[PDB]
Design a protein around this ligand. Structure first.
Ligand code: CL
Ligand code: CL
Ligand code: CL
Ligand code: CL
Ligand code: CL
Ligand code: CL
Ligand code: CL
Ligand code: CL
Lengths: 398, 397
């Protein structure tokens, strides 16, 4: 028969020498291997996936044995094999066992493993021929832009409260015009938001960062506040949503770091330190937040000036600074200054003691006095004058 | 009082704007600065020195502060300053600390002199021309004596490369070779094996200086006689008769070091073995191979119209000129060497359009006639010019 199979440049680009060797090994050893989960959703949406999860009927012991006998190196129910300088993370199909005191049972039933997954658009498998295995209407849901739980929203949320944030993230990722949400899902989120207080800051921060750099971040942050999710994920309860609205417009299209956008919710430095206590963020992330909150009102472009970028250049010359300044320029919506700053090479002071000796000066004190005069001119020019102009200038002084 | 100070054109020639600026700086900052080492020996021998070693009581930290404070550029216990388009390498006086390498800075000139190797290299010269000599180096220099500060055995064992230094400086200062201090020869012979622990790069630097310096014949003989040869990458069974002939052949004609060395090599494998030990440059290796391969067969066309022709043919058929000129030096062909060095490689002087003119229009016929002329031109030793070749071909037609 003829049947529908996926074909695209995004799918084709996955078939590296490693992947071809892996798929041939599993065929040879009579174990089914398929792409699973988020990679499938990405492929169906026309995007090459990264960090693919592969799924198999082989148990972890069978995979170990097979890789061992085939001379294939393993790294790290999941086994990671390395073939042709590429890693492949492969997980045995499983069913969760209900316990009072976490346990799974391996299975070869693809439909049972699909039923374990959260959202219908993430519950699908793809064969390497392009056959789609879809047990929960995920394909139709994806096409209709519906973000829906496998089974009942309340039950799936109460199994892992982080799925509240996943709902938001995938909604941003697939929806075109935001606004339509299933009321049973919103009800489930609002009633169970408090469950997020029991989830690690690390897990939350991973998802929140994806929401912040993803599409429809304005809609989603508003919904997070509107459903009272915000307090349980380390966000201040009384944020300036007006500032967030301005800043989200400012950074749109300019690849903000997640903390850049999050800082528009912070009134004071203490909100960064409170967020850190909850979400356990990296030093770089915290310092970025403090930098923006500290400098957003005062470190601003010069107006009626020869170089509007001069205050920012000063801050950089006087002292990681460039990254922080560029984020600030995004935050402030200074689109016509952002790229200039990204492309600005920090110039050293271009005049040396020797340059002054060459114009006839011999005294150390006099050389230092002249260099100081030249540093001031150089800084005054917005760090733009070069050696000859500066030396020309000093010869006049003399 | 009146005292003896050095005065010569060679000493005066050092006093550039740079050197004057440098000396004034050290006086103003109250640090003694003197010329040291080999530059002093050269000056005492009547020659302007090239890569002068300056010595000072100032520490390296003091010199960096002095130069920075004065806006003077430093380059890369030694500090190098650039003033008035010239570099000056200045080293703080030091003493070596015995360890199971470390030094201590000193302001005692005599202690730094005692660290130096040979008495003729252990002196200092003030910029007024005062000589500071703690180990009889001036007397040894005038008497042509190459003598260690302290005992030869102990100094050689601190740095076995000092064996080659002894040879080098013996060739440099002695006029009639033959008198060697027996304690020094004994120290060399007993410790020659220690050169096996010295890197080939360091050895090759010194060996090259010996090969292009005076009295190379005596020195290579002494290297073999004292059994230093096997430890510095030379073959044990060399043809010293060939060496004697070639050292006489190249004398006065500035041989490259490998040109003279190749006279010790019986076959190409000796070049390859020297290279394994001494890690020589590709051009140095290829010169050795060229000489060994060609010395017997690439020879002048005796009793011919152009004796140089074999060599010219080699160059035309394909660094070849440099290699051939070294071969001519090797071979003692003094009456051919300069002619080759001044020979411009001539292009074949006739083109197809010359054959066309008074031609001949067929491309095929043009190429046949040009071939005939290339042949006459080569036959003539590449000296016939366009007009002579065209007259020749007109006759042929
Ligand atoms: Cl690898
Ligand atoms: Cl958790
Ligand atoms: Cl507000
Ligand atoms: Cl960190
Ligand atoms: Cl600077
Ligand atoms: Cl060494
Ligand atoms: Cl012999
Ligand atoms: Cl030609």
């Amino acid at each position: 028969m003829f049947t529908m199979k996926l074909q695209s440049p995004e799918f084709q680009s996955l078939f590296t020498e490693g992947l071809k060797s892996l798929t041939e090994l599993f065929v040879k050893e009579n174990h089914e291997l398929r792409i699973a989960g988020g990679a499938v959703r990405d492929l169906l949406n026309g995007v090459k996936p990264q960090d693919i999860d592969f799924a198999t009927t082989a148990t972890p012991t069978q995979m170990k044995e097979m890789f061992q006998s085939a001379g294939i190196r393993m790294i790290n129910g999941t086994i990671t094999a390395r073939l042709h300088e590429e890693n492949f993370e492969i997980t045995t199909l499983r069913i969760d066992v209900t316990t009072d005191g976490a346990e799974v049972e391996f299975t070869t039933d693809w439909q049972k493993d699909a039923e374990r997954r959260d959202l219908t658009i993430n519950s699908m498998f793809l064969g390497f021929d392009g056959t789609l295995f879809d047990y929960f209407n995920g394909y139709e849901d994806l096409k209709n832009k519906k973000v829906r739980f496998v089974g009942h929203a309340k039950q799936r949320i109460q199994e892992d409260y982080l799925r509240i944030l996943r709902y938001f993230r995938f909604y941003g990722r697939i929806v075109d015009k935001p606004g339509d949400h299933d009321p049973e899902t919103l009800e489930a989120i609002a009633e169970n938001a408090k469950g997020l207080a029991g989830i690690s800051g690390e897990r939350i921060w991973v998802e929140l960062k994806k929401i912040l750099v993803g599409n429809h971040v304005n809609h989603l942050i508003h919904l997070i506040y509107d459903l009272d999710v915000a307090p349980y994920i380390g966000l201040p309860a009384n944020a300036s949503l007006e500032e967030f609205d301005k800043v989200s417009k400012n950074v749109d299209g300019f690849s903000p770091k997640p903390v850049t956008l999050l800082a528009s919710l912070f009134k004071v430095q203490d909100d960064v330190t409170k967020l850190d206590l909850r979400l356990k963020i990296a030093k770089e992330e915290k310092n970025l937040g403090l930098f923006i909150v500290k400098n957003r009102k005062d470190l601003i472009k010069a107006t009626d000036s020869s170089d509007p970028l001069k205050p920012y250049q000063d801050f950089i010359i006087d002292s990681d600074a460039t990254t922080r300044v560029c984020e600030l320029l995004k935050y402030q919506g200074e689109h016509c200054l952002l790229k200039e700053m990204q492309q600005w090479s920090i110039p050293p002071f271009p005049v040396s003691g020797h340059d002054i000796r060459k114009v006839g000066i011999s005294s150390g004190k006099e050389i230092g006095a002249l260099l100081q005069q030249l540093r001031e001119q150089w800084k005054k020019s917005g760090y733009q004058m070069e050696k000859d102009e500066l030396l020309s200038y000093i010869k006049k002084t003399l």
